[PDB]
CSV table of C-alpha atoms in Angstrom, one decimal:
chain,number,residue,atom,x,y,z
A,1,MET,CA,-62.5,31.7,49.1
A,2,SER,CA,-58.7,31.1,48.6
A,3,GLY,CA,-58.4,27.8,46.7
A,4,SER,CA,-59.0,27.5,42.9
A,5,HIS,CA,-61.4,30.4,42.2
A,6,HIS,CA,-58.5,32.3,40.3
A,7,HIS,CA,-58.4,29.2,38.1
A,8,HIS,CA,-61.0,30.3,35.5
A,9,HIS,CA,-60.4,31.3,31.8
A,10,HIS,CA,-56.8,30.1,31.3
A,11,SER,CA,-54.5,32.4,29.2
A,12,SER,CA,-53.4,29.2,27.4
A,13,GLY,CA,-56.6,28.8,25.3
A,14,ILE,CA,-57.9,25.3,24.4
A,15,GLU,CA,-60.6,24.6,21.7
A,16,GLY,CA,-61.2,22.6,18.5
A,17,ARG,CA,-62.6,25.2,16.1
A,18,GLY,CA,-61.2,26.7,12.9
A,19,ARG,CA,-57.5,27.1,13.8
A,20,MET,CA,-56.9,24.3,11.2
A,21,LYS,CA,-60.3,22.6,11.2
A,22,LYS,CA,-59.6,20.1,13.9
A,23,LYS,CA,-56.5,19.2,16.2
A,24,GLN,CA,-55.2,17.6,19.3
A,25,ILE,CA,-56.7,19.5,22.3
A,26,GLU,CA,-55.1,17.8,25.3
A,27,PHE,CA,-51.5,17.6,23.8
A,28,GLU,CA,-51.6,21.2,22.5
A,29,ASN,CA,-52.8,22.2,26.0
A,30,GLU,CA,-50.0,20.2,27.6
A,31,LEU,CA,-47.2,21.7,25.3
A,32,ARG,CA,-48.5,25.3,25.3
A,33,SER,CA,-48.9,25.5,29.1
A,34,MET,CA,-45.3,24.2,29.4
A,35,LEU,CA,-44.0,26.8,26.9
A,36,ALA,CA,-46.0,29.5,28.8
A,37,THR,CA,-44.3,28.4,32.0
A,38,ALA,CA,-41.0,28.3,30.0
A,39,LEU,CA,-41.5,32.1,29.2
A,40,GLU,CA,-42.1,32.7,32.9
A,41,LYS,CA,-38.8,30.9,33.5
A,42,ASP,CA,-35.5,32.9,33.2
A,43,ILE,CA,-34.5,32.6,29.5
A,44,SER,CA,-31.7,34.7,27.7
A,45,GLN,CA,-32.1,36.8,24.4
A,46,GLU,CA,-31.7,33.7,22.0
A,47,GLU,CA,-34.0,31.2,23.9
A,48,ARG,CA,-36.6,34.0,24.4
A,49,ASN,CA,-36.2,34.8,20.6
A,50,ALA,CA,-37.1,31.1,19.7
A,51,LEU,CA,-40.1,30.9,22.0
A,52,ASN,CA,-41.4,34.4,20.9
A,53,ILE,CA,-41.2,33.2,17.3
A,54,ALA,CA,-43.1,30.2,18.7
A,55,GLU,CA,-46.1,32.3,20.1
A,56,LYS,CA,-46.5,34.3,16.8
A,57,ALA,CA,-46.4,31.2,14.5
A,58,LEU,CA,-48.6,29.0,16.9
A,59,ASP,CA,-51.4,31.7,16.8
A,60,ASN,CA,-50.7,32.4,13.0
A,61,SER,CA,-51.4,28.6,12.5
A,62,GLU,CA,-48.0,27.9,10.9
A,63,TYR,CA,-48.3,24.2,12.0
A,64,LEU,CA,-47.4,21.8,14.8
A,65,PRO,CA,-44.7,19.8,12.7
A,66,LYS,CA,-43.3,23.1,11.5
A,67,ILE,CA,-42.9,24.6,15.1
A,68,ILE,CA,-41.6,21.2,16.6
A,69,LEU,CA,-39.0,21.3,13.8
A,70,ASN,CA,-38.5,25.1,14.6
A,71,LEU,CA,-37.6,24.3,18.3
A,72,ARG,CA,-35.6,21.2,17.4
A,73,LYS,CA,-33.7,23.4,14.7
A,74,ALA,CA,-33.3,26.4,17.1
A,75,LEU,CA,-32.4,24.5,20.4
A,76,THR,CA,-30.4,21.5,19.2
A,77,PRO,CA,-27.3,23.6,17.7
A,78,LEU,CA,-27.4,25.7,21.0
A,79,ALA,CA,-27.3,22.4,23.0
A,80,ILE,CA,-24.3,21.2,20.9
A,81,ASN,CA,-22.6,24.6,21.5
A,82,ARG,CA,-23.5,24.2,25.2
A,83,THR,CA,-25.3,27.5,26.1
A,84,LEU,CA,-29.0,26.5,26.4
A,85,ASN,CA,-30.3,27.4,29.9
A,86,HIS,CA,-31.5,23.8,30.1
A,87,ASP,CA,-34.2,24.7,32.7
A,88,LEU,CA,-36.9,23.4,30.2
A,89,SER,CA,-34.8,20.3,29.3
A,90,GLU,CA,-38.1,18.3,29.8
A,91,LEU,CA,-39.7,20.4,26.9
A,92,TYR,CA,-36.8,19.3,24.7
A,93,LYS,CA,-37.4,15.7,25.9
A,94,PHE,CA,-41.1,16.2,25.4
A,95,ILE,CA,-41.1,16.9,21.6
A,96,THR,CA,-38.9,13.7,21.2
A,97,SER,CA,-40.6,11.5,23.8
A,98,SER,CA,-44.1,12.0,25.1
A,99,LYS,CA,-46.4,11.5,22.1
A,100,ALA,CA,-44.6,13.6,19.6
A,101,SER,CA,-41.4,11.6,18.8
A,102,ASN,CA,-37.9,11.8,17.2
A,103,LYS,CA,-38.6,13.6,13.8
A,104,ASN,CA,-41.7,15.5,15.0
A,105,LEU,CA,-44.7,13.0,15.3
A,106,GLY,CA,-45.3,12.0,11.6
A,107,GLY,CA,-41.8,11.5,10.2
A,108,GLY,CA,-41.0,12.4,6.5
A,109,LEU,CA,-37.9,13.8,4.8
A,110,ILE,CA,-37.5,17.6,5.7
A,111,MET,CA,-34.4,18.0,3.4
A,112,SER,CA,-31.3,20.3,4.0
A,113,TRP,CA,-31.2,20.1,7.8
A,114,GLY,CA,-29.6,16.7,8.4
A,115,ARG,CA,-26.9,17.5,11.0
A,116,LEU,CA,-28.5,14.9,13.3
A,117,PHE,CA,-30.2,12.2,11.2
């Protein structure tokens, strides 16, 4: 059958076991599928570098605020310098407006990096 039989056991894994202890399953699925699509999109050395750093930290459990900060710290100066490929502009809009918002999703003073505050 040629329909959805190939759709079984997604590479972008989704569970609520001991990654932290709990989490958001649907929003993590939504973001990590979009970022997996964003790797399959044509990205240059620097944009690839940020999203490869993203994979290794995501699966090392180095935190959702920390990695939302990481993409907003890595992609915002490249946006201002006008060299981001911009073909995942919706991902940049996503971590500021979807459920995760402005700062990250929780707020708080990060210190040091206040170029856009």
